[PDB]
Amino acid sequence: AVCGSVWGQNDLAYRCRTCEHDPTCAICVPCFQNGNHKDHDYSIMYTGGGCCDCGDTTAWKREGFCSRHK
Ligand SMILES: [Zn+2]
Ligand SMILES: [Zn+2]
Ligand SMILES: [Zn+2]
């Protein structure tokens, strides 16, 4: 339902200021790739590690869910 992916401090992830509900939200690289963020304000970057928010309506807009946690 919600992507269970975890990453470490030197793993890249995605911020998306268009989809997030707060600036600490992030999704893993595969969830970004399998979603639709064209013309979004997104950035691939480091985040000090984290857990993917894809599929979680409390953290991420539904239109920003990838195809596998939609
Ligand atoms: Zn987005
Ligand atoms: Zn994910
Ligand atoms: Zn996903």
Side-chain angles (χ1 to χ4, degrees):
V2 168
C3 181
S5 202
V6 307
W7 65 91
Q9 57 180 312
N10 295 333
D11 298 319
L12 291 166
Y14 278 86
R15 305 289 191 191
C16 187
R17 309 308 180 187
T18 304
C19 291
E20 74 188 24
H21 287 306
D22 80 76
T24 72
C25 298
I27 65 175
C28 70
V29 167
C31 283
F32 183 81
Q33 294 174 343
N34 287 328
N36 307 314
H37 304 269
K38 303 186 191 177
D39 271 334
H40 292 198
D41 178 22
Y42 65 83
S43 296
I44 193 170
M45 49 196 312
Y46 301 100
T47 69
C51 297
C52 186
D53 292 324
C54 182
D56 181 6
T57 58
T58 80
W60 204 260
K61 294 182 198 163
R62 315 203 185 176
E63 325 68 44
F65 294 172
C66 83
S67 54
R68 296 181 60 259
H69 313 103
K70 261 214 109 173

